[PDB]
């Protein structure tokens, strides 16, 4: 099926710190596989997935040296941004970046990504053509003009269509069985009493992977639903629940449909009184 | 394999 790779980078400055903290996290198919943190006693990229543990020492050394260059890039950029926004002293500031590639089921490159944020808001992004930039405001227009004049997009396009795709292929080969591993939701419906002639029905979806899931309540297979946002269980799997307010004695007329990748077909659930 | 940013800063 389709695949992806992303690196999510963050640098945070603060008055009490002489140098910004830098964190880089790599993901393959939305699962963390590598991490670098400047706060560690010995900062280095480390494997975050066991299938990455077989990469030799030259790989770890090469990635770690790149992170040192990124820390400098982010440090200088943070200082420029403080100037662009004429920000006052005594504040903490955040520069973030996302980059990577999306691959189709037929292995073609669907899209390259490159985006930046300052203070948690879009700053500048590389357009889908991998040639032009979108600047979010007046300060980002200063950056856009700089990057157009220096030809920055060409460097980013070459990485996104080349090296990004090549390495994603290599990781997919190593993490083959592990990355294709899905966990089906184990589902059940709970009964909760209410005021008047009414009752709450809660459809629980547990132990599933990946996080993408759909829970749908229906009245005879065809009010606004209440739910919780998908949450991590702590073991690598996810949880979710969806609820409906129904009249007393009418519980069996309502069904909860669970849609997930790991299931051979959608689940159909109902309140089963013990 | 992580990206190293083109040397021009923001």
């Amino acid at each position, epitope marked *: 099926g389709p695949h992806s790779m992303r690196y999510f980078e963050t640098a945070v400055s603060r008055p009490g710190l002489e140098e910004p903290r830098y964190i880089s996290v790599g993901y393959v198919d939305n699962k963390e596989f590598v991490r670098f943190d400047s706060d560690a006693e010995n900062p280095r990229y480390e494997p975050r997935a066991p299938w990455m543990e077989q990469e030799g020492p030259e790989y770890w050394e090469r990635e770690t040296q790149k992170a040192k260059g990124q820390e*400098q890039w982010f440090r*200088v950029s943070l200082r420029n941004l403080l100037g662009y926004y004429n920000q006052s002293a005594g504040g903490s500031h955040t520069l973030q970046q996302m980059s990577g590639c999306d691959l189709g089921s037929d292995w073609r490159l669907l899209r390259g990504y490159l985006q930046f944020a300052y203070e948690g808001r879009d700053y500048i992004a590389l357009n889908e053509d991998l040639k032009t930039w979108t600047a979010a405001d007046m300060a980002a227009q200063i950056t856009r003009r700089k990057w157009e004049q220096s030809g920055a997009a*060409e*460097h980013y396009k*070459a990485y996104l269509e*080349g090296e990004c795709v090549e390495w994603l292929h290599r990781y997919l080969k190593n993490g083959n069985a592990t990355l294709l591993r899905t966990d089906s939701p184990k589902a059940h419906v709970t009964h909760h009493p209410r005021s008047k002639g009414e009752v709450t029905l809660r459809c629980w979806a547990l132990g599933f992977y990946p996080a993408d899931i759909t829970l749908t309540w229906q009245l005879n297979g065809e009010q606004d639903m209440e739910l919780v946002e998908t949450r991590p269980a702590g073991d690598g799997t996810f949880q979710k629940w969806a609820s409906v307010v129904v009249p007393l004695g009418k519980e069996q007329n309502y069904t909860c449909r669970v849609y997930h990748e790991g299931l051979p077909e959608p689940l159909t659930l109902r309140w089963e009184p013990s | 394999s992580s990206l190293c940013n083109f*040397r021009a*800063y923001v």
Partner: T-cell receptor
Amino acid sequence: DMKVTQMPRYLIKRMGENVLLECGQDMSHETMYWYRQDPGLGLQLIYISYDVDSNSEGDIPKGYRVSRKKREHFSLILDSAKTNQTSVYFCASSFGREQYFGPGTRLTVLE
Amino acid sequence: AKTTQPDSMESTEGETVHLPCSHATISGNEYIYWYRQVPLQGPEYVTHGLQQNTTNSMAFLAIASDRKSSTLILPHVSLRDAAVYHCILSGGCNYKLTFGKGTLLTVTP
């Protein structure tokens, strides 16, 4: 538009004396450089400055030190000049495309 | 360091000059830059490229398909073009340049 300034074009110093070479760049580029060039040879990097107080030794740092307190200026200091320090010194700056070079300072250190 | 150029090249004004440059060990994100240095003045940027052939007011840059060699082409050379031409690799994420001896181009009238 892009201009790196270096004065004087020429300087004579006695061996053992302090030397200070100054470089200016009004473009406020983050990156500045000091190179030296001996006759018939390519430029050799002495020090690079990535920003204010963010200096890194180049290929030949011995006998030199630098100062970058402001983005617009970059100083090269010879605490005790040696006759082998006779050379043409070029300062450069960059914003991330090419490097822009100053007109150079010819320094002759004599016994 | 990674680039190899002939030490000298002779040419006559009005002729097409091809300045070769060998860089077999070039990495994917290394740009090919050309700088020139007239008698004793500071070096000056001529052109640069990554994979594609580049045309600008000063010169034409031809980069081989495998990127292991390149050529700086100076059409109808003038006396003003006599200089040392430096072919240098510039990594896309860094600010350093390692100058070599380059090619001293003489232009006879």
